[PDB]
Design a protein around this ligand. Sequence first.
Ligand code: 3RM
Length: 373
Amino acid sequence: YQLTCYFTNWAQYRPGLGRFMPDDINPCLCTHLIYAFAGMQNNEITTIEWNDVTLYQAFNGLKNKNSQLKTLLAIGGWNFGTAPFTAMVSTPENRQTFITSVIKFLRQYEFDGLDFDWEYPGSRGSPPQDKHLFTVLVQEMREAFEQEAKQINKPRLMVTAAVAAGISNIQSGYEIPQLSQYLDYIHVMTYDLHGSWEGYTGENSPLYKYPTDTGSNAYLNVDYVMNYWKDNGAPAEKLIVGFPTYGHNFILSNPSNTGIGAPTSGAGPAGPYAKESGIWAYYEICTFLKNGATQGWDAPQEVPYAYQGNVWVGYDNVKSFDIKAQWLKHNKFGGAMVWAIDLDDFTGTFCNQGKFPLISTLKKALGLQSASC
Ligand SMILES: Nc1nnc(N2CCN(CCOc3ccc(Br)cc3)CC2)[nH]1
C-alpha cells in the first residue's frame, strides 16, 4: 500500500503549537508527500507563498533521510476554483505552455511529480467541455513526462489527481476509464461528506451508511464512493482512499438531541489554532475531549463523535482510522492519503498518544511500519 500525506504551505502561519513547517514532517512516516499548493499565472505553474522555494528545498530535502520517499507538487485546491484550469485547458497552446512549465518546475525544485487538485472539472463554474478536456490535459501531461524521461534519461515524473467524492460531481467531472489509464494514482476525496450546510449532524468521513440514509444520502460514505470509482473504471490498485485528520462541527438546535441526523442551526466554532469556521483539526478535537466533551461512537459508520453544550463534532480517531485501514486492505485498494499531516497531533501534546497518532495508525495498519529509511 501507499501512504500519501498532504502538507499545506499555509500551516506555517498558525499560532504557537499550530505552526507546521516541512522540517516538522517525520521522513519515515509516509511513502509519498504532497506539497499543497502551487498556483498558476499566464498558464504556467507558480509558487503562491513568499517562502515556497525555501520550503520546497526543506520538503524535498526529506528524501535525504528516507531514500524511498517520493514527493509531488499539488496545483490548485478548493479556493483556487476552476477559472485558471478552464482557461488553461481551453486551447492546446495553453496546455503545452502549462505542461512545459510543469516539467521545468518539478525538475528544478526536485519534485517527483504533479498532483492535480482541480476542484472540479464540470462544476463550480467549470463548463461541461472540461470533463473531456481534463482527460486530454492528463493524457498530454503523461505523454510529455514519458517523452522528457527519454530526453534526460531518468525515470519519468509522476502524474496524480485528487478527485471528487460527490456522485453528481463525479458524473459531471470525469471520464473515469480514459482518465484512469493515464494517472499513476487517484486520490479520492472521501471526506466532507456531511456538514452544517445540511441542517443536521452528520459524519465527516463515515465508512458506511447510517441506517436512516436513503436515496441520494445512501451514497455519502467511503465504501460507496470508493466502489463507485472502481465500478466505473478506475483500477483498484490506483485508487487511494482519503483520510481526514480533522472533523466538522455544528451548532445543535437542541442540546438534548445529539445523535446522527439531529437538527443543527449552523456551523460550529472555529478552533483556536486552525481558526476554521465549522472545522477542528484533530489536535483541536483532542482539547475538546480532554476537557470533558461527551464521546459517542457511531457504530453503523465506524466513526466517533463528541458533543458538549450546543457543540457537536463528527471526526476520526485512532479507532476509526484503524477500522478503515483494515477495510481498505480487505478491498485491496492502492492505499491511503491524508488531509493533512499538519492537522494530525504532530507535537503529541494534544492527544497524548504519541506524535502523529492518526498517520502512525495507518502506517502500522498498512504494514508499512518496517519500511526502509
Ligand atoms: N486531496 C485534496 N485536495 N483537496 C482536498 N480538500 C481537503 C479538505 N477541504 C475541505 C475542508 O478543508 C479543511 C479546511 C481547514 C481545516 Br482545519 C481542515 C479541513 C476541501 C479540499 N483534499
